[PDB]
Amino acid sequence: MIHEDFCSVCRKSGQLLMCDTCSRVYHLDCLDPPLKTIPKGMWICPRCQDQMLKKEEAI
Amino acid sequence: HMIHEDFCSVCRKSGQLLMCDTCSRVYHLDCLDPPLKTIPKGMWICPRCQDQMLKKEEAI
Amino acid sequence: ARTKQTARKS
Ligand SMILES: [Zn+2]
Ligand SMILES: [Zn+2]
Ligand SMILES: [Zn+2]
Ligand SMILES: [Zn+2]
């Protein structure tokens, strides 16, 4: 997996958390809720969740 | 519409309960991982729903 | 997201 270099929310560089299922990355401060604590275990980004939810209103 | 539970899914006690936007479950903010210091502004999907979504993908 | 305050009896 080749991850992106800019946050999917604010599009800036920096300390970026990588999504475990897609190439997107995010600043912990740009998540809702924002984190100081890095996620433990598998982490699936907001866009991946949206993707899964979209197919939910379909499936 | 949605009918939410009255007890936290983790500890089974009531009080201030964050309601999941996609199922009937509710959770104390301090019973989440990590304990939440704020009430999410937008949509919040609980751990069980997150797992459910994952499982559907792993089987599709 | 939203919270609610519920007080069940002890
Ligand atoms: Zn950002
Ligand atoms: Zn993702
Ligand atoms: Zn609890
Ligand atoms: Zn849920």
Q: What does it look like?
A:
- Chain A: A zinc finger (PHD-type) spans 4-51.
- Chain A: It is found in: Nucleus.
- Chain A: This is PHD finger protein 21A.
- Chain C: It is found in: Nucleus; Chromosome.
- Chain C: It comes from Zygosaccharomyces bailii.
- The complex is a heterotrimer, with two copies of chain A and one copy of chain C (10 residues).
- By secondary structure, chain A is an alpha+beta fold.
- Chain A is 15% helix and 7% strand.
- Chain A has one helix and two strands; from the N terminus they run ββα.
- In chain A, strand 1 and strand 2 form a beta hairpin.
- In chain A, 10% of the residues are buried.
- Chain C is mainly β and 10 residues long.
- Chain C is built from no helices and one strand.
- The radius of gyration of chain C is 9 Å and the shape is rod-shaped.
- The chains are: A alpha+beta (59), C mainly beta (10).
- One zinc ion binds at residues 7, 9-10, 12, 27, 30 of chain A.
Strand and helix map with partners:
The complex is a heterotrimer, with two copies of chain A and one copy of chain C (10 residues).
Chain A: E1 17-18, E2 25-26, H1 46-54
Antiparallel strand pairs in A: 1-2
Chain C: E1 3-6
